[PDB]
Amino acid sequence: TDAPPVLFTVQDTARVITLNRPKKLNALNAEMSESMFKTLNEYAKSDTTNLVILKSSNRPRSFCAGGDVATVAIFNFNKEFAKSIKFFTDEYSLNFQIATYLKPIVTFMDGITMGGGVGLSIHTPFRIATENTKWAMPEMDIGFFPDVGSTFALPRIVTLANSNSQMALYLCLTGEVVTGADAYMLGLASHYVSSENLDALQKRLGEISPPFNNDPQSAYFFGMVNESIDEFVSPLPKDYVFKYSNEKLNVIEACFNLSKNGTIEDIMNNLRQYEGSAEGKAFAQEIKTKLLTKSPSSLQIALRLVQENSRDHIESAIKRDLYTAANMCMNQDSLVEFSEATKHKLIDKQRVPYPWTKKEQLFVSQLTSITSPKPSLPMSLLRNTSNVTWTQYPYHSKYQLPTEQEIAAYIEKRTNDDTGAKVTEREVLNHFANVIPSRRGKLGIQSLCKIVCERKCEEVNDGLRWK
Amino acid sequence: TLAELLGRSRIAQVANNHKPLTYTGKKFHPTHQIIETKPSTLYRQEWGLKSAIPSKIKSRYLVYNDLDTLERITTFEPRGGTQWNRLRFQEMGVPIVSNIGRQNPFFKYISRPE
Amino acid sequence: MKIQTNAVNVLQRTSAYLKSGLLKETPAWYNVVASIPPSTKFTREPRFKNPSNGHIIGKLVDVTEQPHANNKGLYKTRPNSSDKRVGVKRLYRPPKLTYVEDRLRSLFYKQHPWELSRPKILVENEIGDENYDWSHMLQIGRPLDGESVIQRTMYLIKTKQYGDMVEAYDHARYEFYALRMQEETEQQVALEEAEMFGSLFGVSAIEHGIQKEQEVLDVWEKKVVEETELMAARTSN
Amino acid sequence: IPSANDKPYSSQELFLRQLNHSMRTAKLGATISKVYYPHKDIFYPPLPENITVESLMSAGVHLGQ
């Protein structure tokens, strides 16, 4: 009788999944996650479904404002820890299914995509953004950690100032909101399509089918999906200027450059001892202010996970998030304030930050316990139809803007070639815009390459050196 | 959007006019907006209308009613001669005066209920 | 004409030639077309909004939404005949695009007929480059003309400086007169100043017209004489 | 056939003298921006990824029958 929380519909050979909780900004509860997880397993077995499209019925207001953690907070206050662990086993299992799904999934991030919403798109090689996109990970203000495998995705997909996960740590620890074109240029969105063109794109996606004797799970079909979306991409607004200037990118790359045993204090030291331009110095103070209004325990846990899930395989990174979430709802050592902070902000509307009490510096053992499975609480991710793990996304790189590490590899290779030629910025732009088949004519690809060379490369004579 | 752009397009700027292009009555003032094309565009029959104007037209000024019609032609006359009447009036340097001594319509005068 | 099938299925008909062996070698286009499927639906699509004025298409006002009496003083208690006719055709008919500026444009050129005599160039340069601040009437890149007035009027009504469109239009008209008067003086004075420094001009506009009228009046003289002599002979009959 | 240094320029030399002026001086004073040149459509077409609705509209592609 009530409107189903998630609506499933057929679009020719494409199956459209639509989040249908407009009053809650499409917040994800256990019911929604379970429904989507079960229906996706069926579509994986089907031989008539070529691709899936995850969208919202509330666009452009919101796509998914995040998992329903306010309800999980009430569970903690009522000691309904079994209910809380069910909510995270369903959500995290759905994020693992999407990541390893063998058929193309195309998420329309037409609106607020924060928290659980990021998990619905970050794990898909086709995550389309719009002018209305608002990507953020505001967990540090609620006392929680960066969940939904964001500690495995962001350190591997961000394009600028992410050599050592510096930008990934900046977004997860500061909760900065990225909007539209900026999300596309950072690597948060694979494509940038105007909202007005989403209807037409959806129809084209339903009409395309694998040719001859190729299944929809073949790499050939994935290329076809990428090309179809590109036909609907339009040039960026003329006035658009990237959000982060080179100077602001230099602050993040230096102030968030930790070692394998770094701590949040080390970042605080860099932000407090930074030297350089006036804008950079002022920018470092802004970060320091923000990072001092977060949960002292959440920041340390986030850094731990980023330094742990940036070199591990997908399954172990998603499993480690389930353990952390369960080890936080059940606060055995009173080291976190997830439940109390969640009620201060969501259950009760309070603009002021929650006054923090756990302001100590957790030890390496304390962090290990909070992020390790307790032998008394057995929790496992639901089984998906793929049941595969890997350390690198199989398709994200091909269909998004190149990272700063891929441009460096070509400059080093070209600079160390027997040709004995000089690497020139013009040659770099051509090599990324008119050579790679999957990146040919990719929006904002020349602009990104010029940002990298102007900040990372040294122009000597008619050559380029990787500073 | 496309609709917003269209409303501001140069074709939208020309007010709708269906007055006879061939009028044999008394003419007191211009009735159609003169359209001008540059020499480069004239060489390519480009006038900024829907269709190319026939190459026979050598004048750079025309007046039209309909962009397209059921006869698959543009309704136009290759003449722009009301502009030369205005410029010849300017060369005579005779200001236009009111024979009734009314207020100048181009000045925002403070009028009363006289 | 019937929806054609054979133009969009060249890949499938070609694939049968290759599979059977009738065609030995794959054509060069074969791979390109396979990766980029043609659109083959050719359907009529409904539309639920006029993009120009945002009017909603396909909405029926129910009697429950008209509780108050009408202009005649009667309440509406039952659907009328128009409400009971299916209106699917309106969903598919291309909407008529309308603009408020069109009404003002017609007014301006009715009030100023001679503005039509100023040639207008319809050839666009680049619509995307237009960076205009309509706080002022003059703009770098475009002429001063009736459109300058209309866009100024819209900016005034958009900024809510004036409430009635007529008042905003009148305000813009006076700004237009001032700019037109400064230009009429700059041209008159420029000509006067040049002649005072020894500038010479071959043919003036008035002279150009006299010469053209002479060319026509010369042909007219011949024909009149010829046709006033055929009449004399024909009438003599 | 160059003319004698005392004689005036020949018709051919005046043409070459004008061509010299055309290259250097004839374009002094201002540059032209945001103006459509018909020939550049053929010789300097844009790439498909840089095409906008404005660009299509500027060319009159939207004007149907």
mmCIF file of all heavy atoms in Angstrom, chain A residues 211-246:
data_model
loop_
_atom_site.group_PDB
_atom_site.id
_atom_site.type_symbol
_atom_site.label_atom_id
_atom_site.label_comp_id
_atom_site.label_asym_id
_atom_site.label_seq_id
_atom_site.Cartn_x
_atom_site.Cartn_y
_atom_site.Cartn_z
ATOM 1 N N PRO A 211 27.214 -6.661 -29.358
ATOM 2 C CA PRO A 211 27.087 -7.125 -30.741
ATOM 3 C C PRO A 211 27.588 -8.546 -30.945
ATOM 4 O O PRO A 211 28.504 -9.023 -30.275
ATOM 5 C CB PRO A 211 27.962 -6.124 -31.508
ATOM 6 C CG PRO A 211 29.053 -5.803 -30.548
ATOM 7 C CD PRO A 211 28.451 -5.884 -29.161
ATOM 8 N N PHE A 212 26.956 -9.220 -31.906
ATOM 9 C CA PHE A 212 27.370 -10.544 -32.379
ATOM 10 C C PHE A 212 27.366 -11.515 -31.203
ATOM 11 O O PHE A 212 26.304 -11.693 -30.582
ATOM 12 C CB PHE A 212 28.709 -10.387 -33.104
ATOM 13 C CG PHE A 212 28.761 -9.206 -34.026
ATOM 14 C CD1 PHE A 212 29.839 -8.340 -34.000
ATOM 15 C CD2 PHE A 212 27.733 -8.962 -34.919
ATOM 16 C CE1 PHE A 212 29.891 -7.254 -34.846
ATOM 17 C CE2 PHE A 212 27.779 -7.876 -35.767
ATOM 18 C CZ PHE A 212 28.860 -7.021 -35.731
ATOM 19 N N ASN A 213 28.486 -12.150 -30.862
ATOM 20 C CA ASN A 213 28.550 -13.180 -29.829
ATOM 21 C C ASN A 213 29.317 -12.691 -28.604
ATOM 22 O O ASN A 213 30.070 -13.441 -27.980
ATOM 23 C CB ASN A 213 29.189 -14.451 -30.385
ATOM 24 C CG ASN A 213 29.108 -15.619 -29.419
ATOM 25 O OD1 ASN A 213 28.020 -16.083 -29.076
ATOM 26 N ND2 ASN A 213 30.264 -16.103 -28.977
ATOM 27 N N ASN A 214 29.134 -11.424 -28.245
ATOM 28 C CA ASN A 214 29.748 -10.842 -27.061
ATOM 29 C C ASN A 214 28.683 -10.659 -25.989
ATOM 30 O O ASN A 214 27.593 -10.153 -26.271
ATOM 31 C CB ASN A 214 30.408 -9.498 -27.382
ATOM 32 C CG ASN A 214 31.430 -9.601 -28.499
ATOM 33 O OD1 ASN A 214 32.369 -10.393 -28.424
ATOM 34 N ND2 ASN A 214 31.259 -8.788 -29.537
ATOM 35 N N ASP A 215 28.994 -11.088 -24.773
ATOM 36 C CA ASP A 215 28.095 -10.918 -23.645
ATOM 37 C C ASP A 215 28.220 -9.502 -23.100
ATOM 38 O O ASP A 215 29.175 -8.784 -23.407
ATOM 39 C CB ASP A 215 28.411 -11.964 -22.578
ATOM 40 C CG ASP A 215 29.790 -11.787 -21.972
ATOM 41 O OD1 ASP A 215 30.538 -10.896 -22.427
ATOM 42 O OD2 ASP A 215 30.129 -12.542 -21.038
ATOM 43 N N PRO A 216 27.262 -9.055 -22.282
ATOM 44 C CA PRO A 216 27.383 -7.715 -21.687
ATOM 45 C C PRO A 216 28.514 -7.593 -20.683
ATOM 46 O O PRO A 216 28.841 -6.469 -20.281
ATOM 47 C CB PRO A 216 26.018 -7.502 -21.023
ATOM 48 C CG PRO A 216 25.517 -8.872 -20.752
ATOM 49 C CD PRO A 216 25.997 -9.706 -21.902
ATOM 50 N N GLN A 217 29.121 -8.701 -20.269
ATOM 51 C CA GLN A 217 30.212 -8.684 -19.306
ATOM 52 C C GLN A 217 31.577 -8.540 -19.964
ATOM 53 O O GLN A 217 32.586 -8.459 -19.256
ATOM 54 C CB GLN A 217 30.178 -9.963 -18.464
ATOM 55 C CG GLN A 217 28.896 -10.138 -17.671
ATOM 56 C CD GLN A 217 28.897 -11.396 -16.824
ATOM 57 O OE1 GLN A 217 29.854 -12.171 -16.845
ATOM 58 N NE2 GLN A 217 27.824 -11.604 -16.071
ATOM 59 N N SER A 218 31.634 -8.510 -21.292
ATOM 60 C CA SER A 218 32.894 -8.368 -22.003
ATOM 61 C C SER A 218 33.380 -6.925 -21.960
ATOM 62 O O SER A 218 32.591 -5.980 -21.877
ATOM 63 C CB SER A 218 32.741 -8.819 -23.456
ATOM 64 O OG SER A 218 31.882 -7.951 -24.175
ATOM 65 N N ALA A 219 34.704 -6.765 -22.015
ATOM 66 C CA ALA A 219 35.281 -5.427 -22.069
ATOM 67 C C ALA A 219 34.775 -4.656 -23.279
ATOM 68 O O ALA A 219 34.648 -3.428 -23.225
ATOM 69 C CB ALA A 219 36.806 -5.512 -22.099
ATOM 70 N N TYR A 220 34.481 -5.355 -24.376
ATOM 71 C CA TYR A 220 33.991 -4.681 -25.574
ATOM 72 C C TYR A 220 32.713 -3.906 -25.279
ATOM 73 O O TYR A 220 32.559 -2.760 -25.719
ATOM 74 C CB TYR A 220 33.760 -5.707 -26.686
ATOM 75 C CG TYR A 220 33.359 -5.115 -28.022
ATOM 76 C CD1 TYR A 220 34.246 -5.109 -29.090
ATOM 77 C CD2 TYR A 220 32.097 -4.565 -28.219
ATOM 78 C CE1 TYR A 220 33.891 -4.574 -30.310
ATOM 79 C CE2 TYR A 220 31.737 -4.026 -29.438
ATOM 80 C CZ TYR A 220 32.637 -4.034 -30.480
ATOM 81 O OH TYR A 220 32.283 -3.500 -31.695
ATOM 82 N N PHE A 221 31.782 -4.514 -24.541
ATOM 83 C CA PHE A 221 30.532 -3.831 -24.225
ATOM 84 C C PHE A 221 30.763 -2.660 -23.279
ATOM 85 O O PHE A 221 30.074 -1.637 -23.372
ATOM 86 C CB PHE A 221 29.534 -4.816 -23.619
ATOM 87 C CG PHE A 221 28.159 -4.245 -23.433
ATOM 88 C CD1 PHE A 221 27.444 -3.761 -24.515
ATOM 89 C CD2 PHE A 221 27.581 -4.190 -22.176
ATOM 90 C CE1 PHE A 221 26.180 -3.235 -24.347
ATOM 91 C CE2 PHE A 221 26.317 -3.666 -22.004
ATOM 92 C CZ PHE A 221 25.615 -3.187 -23.091
ATOM 93 N N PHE A 222 31.720 -2.789 -22.359
ATOM 94 C CA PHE A 222 32.019 -1.677 -21.463
ATOM 95 C C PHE A 222 32.475 -0.455 -22.250
ATOM 96 O O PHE A 222 32.092 0.676 -21.931
ATOM 97 C CB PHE A 222 33.079 -2.093 -20.444
ATOM 98 C CG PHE A 222 32.516 -2.761 -19.223
ATOM 99 C CD1 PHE A 222 32.074 -4.070 -19.273
ATOM 100 C CD2 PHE A 222 32.427 -2.076 -18.023
ATOM 101 C CE1 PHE A 222 31.556 -4.683 -18.149
ATOM 102 C CE2 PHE A 222 31.910 -2.684 -16.898
ATOM 103 C CZ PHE A 222 31.474 -3.988 -16.960
ATOM 104 N N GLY A 223 33.291 -0.663 -23.284
ATOM 105 C CA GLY A 223 33.669 0.444 -24.147
ATOM 106 C C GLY A 223 32.472 1.073 -24.834
ATOM 107 O O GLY A 223 32.403 2.294 -24.991
ATOM 108 N N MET A 224 31.514 0.245 -25.257
ATOM 109 C CA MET A 224 30.314 0.766 -25.905
ATOM 110 C C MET A 224 29.525 1.660 -24.960
ATOM 111 O O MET A 224 29.024 2.716 -25.364
ATOM 112 C CB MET A 224 29.442 -0.392 -26.390
ATOM 113 C CG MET A 224 29.997 -1.123 -27.600
ATOM 114 S SD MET A 224 28.906 -2.418 -28.220
ATOM 115 C CE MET A 224 27.380 -1.520 -28.487
ATOM 116 N N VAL A 225 29.393 1.249 -23.698
ATOM 117 C CA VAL A 225 28.688 2.075 -22.724
ATOM 118 C C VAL A 225 29.398 3.411 -22.557
ATOM 119 O O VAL A 225 28.760 4.470 -22.508
ATOM 120 C CB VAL A 225 28.562 1.326 -21.384
ATOM 121 C CG1 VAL A 225 28.061 2.260 -20.292
ATOM 122 C CG2 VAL A 225 27.645 0.118 -21.534
ATOM 123 N N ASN A 226 30.728 3.384 -22.471
ATOM 124 C CA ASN A 226 31.484 4.621 -22.306
ATOM 125 C C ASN A 226 31.250 5.566 -23.479
ATOM 126 O O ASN A 226 31.023 6.766 -23.290
ATOM 127 C CB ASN A 226 32.972 4.302 -22.157
ATOM 128 C CG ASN A 226 33.833 5.547 -22.110
ATOM 129 O OD1 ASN A 226 33.928 6.211 -21.079
ATOM 130 N ND2 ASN A 226 34.471 5.866 -23.229
ATOM 131 N N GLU A 227 31.294 5.039 -24.705
ATOM 132 C CA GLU A 227 31.076 5.883 -25.875
ATOM 133 C C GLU A 227 29.672 6.475 -25.882
ATOM 134 O O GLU A 227 29.489 7.647 -26.229
ATOM 135 C CB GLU A 227 31.325 5.087 -27.157
ATOM 136 C CG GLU A 227 31.132 5.912 -28.422
ATOM 137 C CD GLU A 227 32.125 7.060 -28.534
ATOM 138 O OE1 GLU A 227 33.178 7.009 -27.862
ATOM 139 O OE2 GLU A 227 31.841 8.027 -29.271
ATOM 140 N N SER A 228 28.665 5.680 -25.513
ATOM 141 C CA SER A 228 27.296 6.182 -25.518
ATOM 142 C C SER A 228 27.155 7.397 -24.607
ATOM 143 O O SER A 228 26.534 8.398 -24.978
ATOM 144 C CB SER A 228 26.331 5.076 -25.092
ATOM 145 O OG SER A 228 26.264 4.051 -26.068
ATOM 146 N N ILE A 229 27.732 7.325 -23.405
ATOM 147 C CA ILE A 229 27.656 8.453 -22.481
ATOM 148 C C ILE A 229 28.376 9.666 -23.057
ATOM 149 O O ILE A 229 27.922 10.807 -22.903
ATOM 150 C CB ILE A 229 28.232 8.059 -21.107
ATOM 151 C CG1 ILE A 229 27.467 6.869 -20.518
ATOM 152 C CG2 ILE A 229 28.186 9.242 -20.147
ATOM 153 C CD1 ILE A 229 28.238 6.119 -19.453
ATOM 154 N N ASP A 230 29.508 9.443 -23.730
ATOM 155 C CA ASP A 230 30.279 10.559 -24.269
ATOM 156 C C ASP A 230 29.481 11.360 -25.290
ATOM 157 O O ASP A 230 29.643 12.582 -25.382
ATOM 158 C CB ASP A 230 31.573 10.045 -24.899
ATOM 159 C CG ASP A 230 32.617 9.667 -23.864
ATOM 160 O OD1 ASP A 230 32.599 10.240 -22.756
ATOM 161 O OD2 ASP A 230 33.462 8.797 -24.165
ATOM 162 N N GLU A 231 28.614 10.700 -26.061
ATOM 163 C CA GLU A 231 27.815 11.416 -27.050
ATOM 164 C C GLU A 231 26.888 12.439 -26.410
ATOM 165 O O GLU A 231 26.474 13.391 -27.082
ATOM 166 C CB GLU A 231 27.004 10.416 -27.879
ATOM 167 C CG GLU A 231 27.861 9.412 -28.640
ATOM 168 C CD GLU A 231 27.103 8.155 -29.028
ATOM 169 O OE1 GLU A 231 26.039 7.886 -28.434
ATOM 170 O OE2 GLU A 231 27.583 7.431 -29.925
ATOM 171 N N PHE A 232 26.555 12.271 -25.132
ATOM 172 C CA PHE A 232 25.679 13.195 -24.424
ATOM 173 C C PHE A 232 26.445 14.212 -23.588
ATOM 174 O O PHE A 232 25.832 15.153 -23.073
ATOM 175 C CB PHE A 232 24.705 12.413 -23.537
ATOM 176 C CG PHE A 232 23.653 11.675 -24.312
ATOM 177 C CD1 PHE A 232 23.824 10.342 -24.637
ATOM 178 C CD2 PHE A 232 22.508 12.321 -24.744
ATOM 179 C CE1 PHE A 232 22.864 9.662 -25.358
ATOM 180 C CE2 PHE A 232 21.546 11.645 -25.464
ATOM 181 C CZ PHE A 232 21.725 10.313 -25.773
ATOM 182 N N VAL A 233 27.760 14.045 -23.439
ATOM 183 C CA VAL A 233 28.566 15.018 -22.714
ATOM 184 C C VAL A 233 28.641 16.306 -23.523
ATOM 185 O O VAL A 233 28.697 16.283 -24.760
ATOM 186 C CB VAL A 233 29.973 14.460 -22.436
ATOM 187 C CG1 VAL A 233 30.871 15.541 -21.844
ATOM 188 C CG2 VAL A 233 29.904 13.256 -21.510
ATOM 189 N N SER A 234 28.638 17.436 -22.829
ATOM 190 C CA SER A 234 28.732 18.746 -23.448
ATOM 191 C C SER A 234 29.906 19.522 -22.867
ATOM 192 O O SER A 234 30.371 19.226 -21.760
ATOM 193 C CB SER A 234 27.436 19.544 -23.244
ATOM 194 O OG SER A 234 26.379 19.003 -24.018
ATOM 195 N N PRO A 235 30.419 20.516 -23.593
ATOM 196 C CA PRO A 235 31.569 21.274 -23.089
ATOM 197 C C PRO A 235 31.245 21.994 -21.788
ATOM 198 O O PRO A 235 30.114 22.428 -21.556
ATOM 199 C CB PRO A 235 31.865 22.264 -24.223
ATOM 200 C CG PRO A 235 31.268 21.628 -25.435
ATOM 201 C CD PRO A 235 30.023 20.973 -24.935
ATOM 202 N N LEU A 236 32.259 22.108 -20.930
ATOM 203 C CA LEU A 236 32.082 22.743 -19.636
ATOM 204 C C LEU A 236 31.719 24.217 -19.811
ATOM 205 O O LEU A 236 32.015 24.822 -20.845
ATOM 206 C CB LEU A 236 33.355 22.617 -18.803
ATOM 207 C CG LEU A 236 33.683 21.216 -18.278
ATOM 208 C CD1 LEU A 236 35.032 21.216 -17.580
ATOM 209 C CD2 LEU A 236 32.594 20.713 -17.342
ATOM 210 N N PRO A 237 31.070 24.815 -18.813
ATOM 211 C CA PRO A 237 30.748 26.244 -18.897
ATOM 212 C C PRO A 237 31.998 27.080 -19.132
ATOM 213 O O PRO A 237 33.070 26.798 -18.592
ATOM 214 C CB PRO A 237 30.112 26.542 -17.536
ATOM 215 C CG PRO A 237 29.572 25.234 -17.079
ATOM 216 C CD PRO A 237 30.543 24.207 -17.577
ATOM 217 N N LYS A 238 31.850 28.122 -19.954
ATOM 218 C CA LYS A 238 32.996 28.954 -20.307
ATOM 219 C C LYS A 238 33.629 29.584 -19.072
ATOM 220 O O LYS A 238 34.858 29.621 -18.944
ATOM 221 C CB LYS A 238 32.563 30.038 -21.295
ATOM 222 C CG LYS A 238 32.119 29.500 -22.646
ATOM 223 C CD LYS A 238 32.207 30.561 -23.730
ATOM 224 C CE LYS A 238 31.845 29.992 -25.089
ATOM 225 N NZ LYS A 238 32.072 30.972 -26.185
ATOM 226 N N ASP A 239 32.805 30.086 -18.153
ATOM 227 C CA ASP A 239 33.309 30.766 -16.966
ATOM 228 C C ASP A 239 33.909 29.814 -15.939
ATOM 229 O O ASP A 239 34.579 30.281 -15.012
ATOM 230 C CB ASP A 239 32.185 31.572 -16.312
ATOM 231 C CG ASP A 239 31.744 32.753 -17.157
ATOM 232 O OD1 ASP A 239 32.490 33.143 -18.079
ATOM 233 O OD2 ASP A 239 30.646 33.289 -16.900
ATOM 234 N N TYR A 240 33.683 28.508 -16.071
ATOM 235 C CA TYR A 240 34.099 27.571 -15.036
ATOM 236 C C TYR A 240 35.601 27.647 -14.793
ATOM 237 O O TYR A 240 36.400 27.629 -15.734
ATOM 238 C CB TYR A 240 33.711 26.145 -15.422
ATOM 239 C CG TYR A 240 34.437 25.091 -14.616
ATOM 240 C CD1 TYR A 240 34.013 24.754 -13.338
ATOM 241 C CD2 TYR A 240 35.544 24.431 -15.133
ATOM 242 C CE1 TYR A 240 34.674 23.796 -12.595
ATOM 243 C CE2 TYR A 240 36.209 23.469 -14.398
ATOM 244 C CZ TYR A 240 35.770 23.156 -13.132
ATOM 245 O OH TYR A 240 36.430 22.199 -12.397
ATOM 246 N N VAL A 241 35.979 27.731 -13.519
ATOM 247 C CA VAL A 241 37.371 27.678 -13.090
ATOM 248 C C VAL A 241 37.481 26.594 -12.028
ATOM 249 O O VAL A 241 36.668 26.550 -11.098
ATOM 250 C CB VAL A 241 37.861 29.029 -12.537
ATOM 251 C CG1 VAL A 241 39.289 28.908 -12.018
ATOM 252 C CG2 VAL A 241 37.770 30.107 -13.605
ATOM 253 N N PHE A 242 38.470 25.714 -12.175
ATOM 254 C CA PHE A 242 38.656 24.637 -11.213
ATOM 255 C C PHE A 242 38.674 25.187 -9.792
ATOM 256 O O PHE A 242 39.158 26.292 -9.532
ATOM 257 C CB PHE A 242 39.948 23.873 -11.508
ATOM 258 C CG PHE A 242 40.142 22.656 -10.649
ATOM 259 C CD1 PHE A 242 39.152 21.692 -10.559
ATOM 260 C CD2 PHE A 242 41.313 22.472 -9.936
ATOM 261 C CE1 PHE A 242 39.323 20.574 -9.770
ATOM 262 C CE2 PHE A 242 41.491 21.353 -9.147
ATOM 263 C CZ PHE A 242 40.495 20.403 -9.065
ATOM 264 N N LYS A 243 38.130 24.396 -8.865
ATOM 265 C CA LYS A 243 37.937 24.866 -7.498
ATOM 266 C C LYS A 243 39.266 25.093 -6.784
ATOM 267 O O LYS A 243 39.430 26.094 -6.077
ATOM 268 C CB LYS A 243 37.068 23.862 -6.737
ATOM 269 C CG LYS A 243 37.094 23.983 -5.220
ATOM 270 C CD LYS A 243 36.293 22.860 -4.589
ATOM 271 C CE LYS A 243 35.968 23.147 -3.136
ATOM 272 N NZ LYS A 243 35.052 22.119 -2.575
ATOM 273 N N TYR A 244 40.221 24.183 -6.950
ATOM 274 C CA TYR A 244 41.484 24.231 -6.223
ATOM 275 C C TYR A 244 42.590 24.762 -7.126
ATOM 276 O O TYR A 244 42.878 24.175 -8.175
ATOM 277 C CB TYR A 244 41.853 22.847 -5.691
ATOM 278 C CG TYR A 244 40.813 22.253 -4.774
ATOM 279 C CD1 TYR A 244 40.147 21.085 -5.112
ATOM 280 C CD2 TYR A 244 40.496 22.863 -3.568
ATOM 281 C CE1 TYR A 244 39.196 20.539 -4.275
ATOM 282 C CE2 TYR A 244 39.548 22.324 -2.724
ATOM 283 C CZ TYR A 244 38.900 21.162 -3.083
ATOM 284 O OH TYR A 244 37.953 20.620 -2.249
ATOM 285 N N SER A 245 43.206 25.865 -6.715
ATOM 286 C CA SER A 245 44.340 26.421 -7.435
ATOM 287 C C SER A 245 45.612 25.657 -7.082
ATOM 288 O O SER A 245 45.696 24.977 -6.055
ATOM 289 C CB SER A 245 44.510 27.906 -7.113
ATOM 290 O OG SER A 245 44.721 28.112 -5.727
ATOM 291 N N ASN A 246 46.609 25.766 -7.961
ATOM 292 C CA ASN A 246 47.873 25.064 -7.774
ATOM 293 C C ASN A 246 48.416 25.285 -6.369
ATOM 294 O O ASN A 246 48.888 24.342 -5.725
ATOM 295 C CB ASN A 246 48.900 25.520 -8.812
ATOM 296 C CG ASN A 246 48.633 24.945 -10.188
ATOM 297 O OD1 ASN A 246 47.629 24.268 -10.407
ATOM 298 N ND2 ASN A 246 49.538 25.208 -11.123
#
